[PDB]
Amino acid sequence: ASFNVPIIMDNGTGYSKLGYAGNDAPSYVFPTVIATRSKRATEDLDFFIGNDALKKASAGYSLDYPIRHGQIENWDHMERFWQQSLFKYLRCEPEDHYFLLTEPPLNPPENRENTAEIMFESFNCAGLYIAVQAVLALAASWTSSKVTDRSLTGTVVDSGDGVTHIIPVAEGYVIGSSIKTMPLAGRDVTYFVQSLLRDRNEPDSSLKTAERIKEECCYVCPDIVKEFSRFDREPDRYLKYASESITGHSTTIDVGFERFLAPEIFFNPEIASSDFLTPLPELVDNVVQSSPIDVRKGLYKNIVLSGGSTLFKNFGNRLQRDLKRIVDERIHRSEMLSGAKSGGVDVNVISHKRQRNAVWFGGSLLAQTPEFGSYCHTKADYEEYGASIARRYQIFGNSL
């Protein structure tokens, strides 16, 4: 492999985190959005991305998010997003560098195939590793890079903008049969905040204002009928949020029960959706109880949080208490049949200083390894087998 630093690109549904292996942060963290125009033809040169795309809606560009619900679904826009990432922001030559890419555990064979042909034929990268994204978020949880600080067994709950998935990993191996996914994350709680501002007919219900009300005003409560009652009993529970309009004037928004009812989307997904029903503490139980019996203590002892939509105030404490309730009720059913007390299991949900970008920090830490260039597809593999080299699922069991 080349001696140049690998380039790390976590392309999320909400945000892309771009940087180089071994740095103390991503070089860029900006929305996974493209601004596109809607006698020589140049409208495919005229686009913008990230923070510079958000500035272009008033100039008549159509904004789009080429990743939705965790999966790339517009390969024209994702190719233009990557070329602009590589040549504007990272300012790099693909021929000199190995790349770490990411996508959700479910992601189609078709997506890794389409990713490999853009990377090896459009850009001609030296080599590509498409990582299992929340497996990197386990490695970001270490107290330091030294081997004695590693905890190679843990459940990881990743919750970004587009999807939340719970991954069991034990001794560094991903138990792919036990992956659970909930199709609801940080964007669906924004659409719920937006919908509640809109039901009150508030002066502003733009998407940025609903987003900023999540980041600043929202938190996870114990129980929504007790918390609705606390919003009768105590008057300063309602906040006032000052927002500036697209046409440049002030507004003031009263923010109310969406402060607790919007983060409740994870703990009662029947608020968000007709199609998904199991709450996150029961969904994490289903991951560990489908997983092999000898790893269950290790998977409960280390439940790592990952992705921006896990950062709600009191989120890890609600998950820990509700999962500890599920776990001890199941252990006590067995103690009451057997007539003897167990040792129990400690359920620990872990929030940590790198939790916001744990996939990128893990990708950086794993791409720093001396062995890394041997796990990549090299362009010499792609010259023989084409994009079919990337098609086989890494995380799940394959037939053949």
Ligand X SMILES: Nc1ncnc2c1ncn2[C@@H]1O[C@H](COP(=O)(O)OP(=O)(O)O)[C@@H](O)[C@H]1O
Identify whether the C-beta of residue 360 lies closer than 8 Å to the C-beta of residue 137.
no
246 interacts with, out of Mg ion, ligand X, another protein, none, CB within 5 to 8 A per kind: another protein
Nearer to another protein, 178 or 194 (CB): 194
Query: Which residue lies nearer to another protein by CB, 39 or 249?
Result: 39
308 is an interface residue for ligand X by CB under 6 A: yes
Q: Is 50 in the site for ligand X (CB under 6 A)?
A: no
Stretch that binds ligand X, among 39-47, 85-93, 211-219, 245-253 (CB under 6 A): 211-219
Does 302 participate in binding ligand X (rule CB under 6 A)?
Answer: no
The reply to whether 312 sits near ligand X by the rule CB under 6 A is yes
Strand runs labelled E in the chain: 7-11, 15-20, 28-31, 34-37, 48-49, 61-64, 67-68, 71-72, 98-103, 127-132, 154-159, 164-170, 173-174, 180-182, 239-244, 250-255, 303-306, 349-350, 377-378
Please, what is the minimum distance in Å from the beta carbon of residue 287 to another protein?
Answer: 29
Q: Going residue by residue from 11 to 50, which x/- string records binding to another protein, judged by CB under 8 A?
A: ---------------------------xxxxx--------
- Any contact of residue 117 with another protein (CB under 8 A)? yes
127, 154, 162, 363: residue in contact with ligand X (rule CB under 6 A): 162
Residues 6+ apart with CB under 8 A from 111: 71, 72, 103
Token pair recorded at residue 391: 């098609």
Examine residue 271 and tell whether it contacts another protein (CB under 8 A). no
**214 contact choice in ligand X, another protein, Mg ion, none (CB below 5 to 8 Å, kind-dependent):** ligand X
What would the two tokens of residue 374 be? 């041997």
> Binding to ligand X by residue 13, rule CB under 6 A?
yes
User: Residue 187 and residue 210: Cα distance in Å, rounded?
Assistant: 10
Q: Which is nearer to ligand X, 67 or 170 (CB)?
A: 67
Binding to another protein, residues 299-358 (CB under 8 A): none
What's the one-letter identity of residue 229?
A: S
Task: List binders of ligand X among 263-292 (CB under 6 A).
Answer: none
Closest approach of Mg ion to the CB of residue 31, in Å = 12
Q: Is 214 in the site for ligand X (CB under 6 A)?
A: yes
- Positive or negative, the CA dihedral 213, 219, 225, 230 is negative
Which residues have CB under 8 Å from 390's CB, separation 6+? 112, 113, 115, 116, 128, 130, 377
Candidates 370, 13, 3, 356; CA nearest to 184 is: 13
66 binds ligand X (CB under 6 A): no
Distance, CA of 165 to CA of 106 (rounded, Å)? 9
Cβ neighbours of residue 399 under 8 Å, at least 6 residues apart? Answer: none
Q: How many CB atoms lie within 10 A of CB 271?
A: 16
Interaction of residue 160 with Mg ion, rule CB under 5 A: yes
Task: Give the x-and-dash track for 14-33 against ligand X (CB under 6 A).
Answer: xx------------------
Q: Which of 73, 216, 222, 246 binds another protein (CB under 8 A)?
A: 246
Per the CB < 8 A criterion, the answer to whether 305 and 315 are in contact is yes
Inter-residue contact 161 to 16 (CB < 8 Å): no
In the complex, minimum distance from the CB of residue 121 to ligand X, in angstroms, rounded to a whole number = 26
Smallest separation, CB 70 to ligand X (Å): 7
Q: Does 146 bind another protein (CB under 8 A)?
A: no
- Distances, alpha carbon 215 to alpha carbons 123, 224, 242, 262, 272, in Å: 36, 19, 14, 11, 19
Query: Coil, strand, or helix at residue 333?
Result: helix
Q: Which is nearer to ligand X, 271 or 311 (CB)?
A: 311
Q: Could you give the C-alpha distances from 297 to 112, 143, 303, in angstroms and in order?
A: 34, 21, 11
**Segment contacting another protein (CB under 8 A): 58-66, 86-94, 156-164, 236-244?**
58-66
In the list 191, 219, 241, 372, the residue contacting another protein (rule: CB under 8 A) is 191
Q: Does 12 participate in binding Mg ion (rule CB under 5 A)?
A: yes
Q: Which residues bind another protein (CB under 8 A)?
A: 38-42, 57, 60, 62-63, 65, 117, 121, 191, 194, 198, 206-207, 246
Q: Which residues contribute to the site for ligand X (CB under 6 A)?
A: 12-15, 160-162, 186-187, 211, 214-215, 307-309, 311-312
Residues that bind Mg ion (CB under 5 A): 12, 160
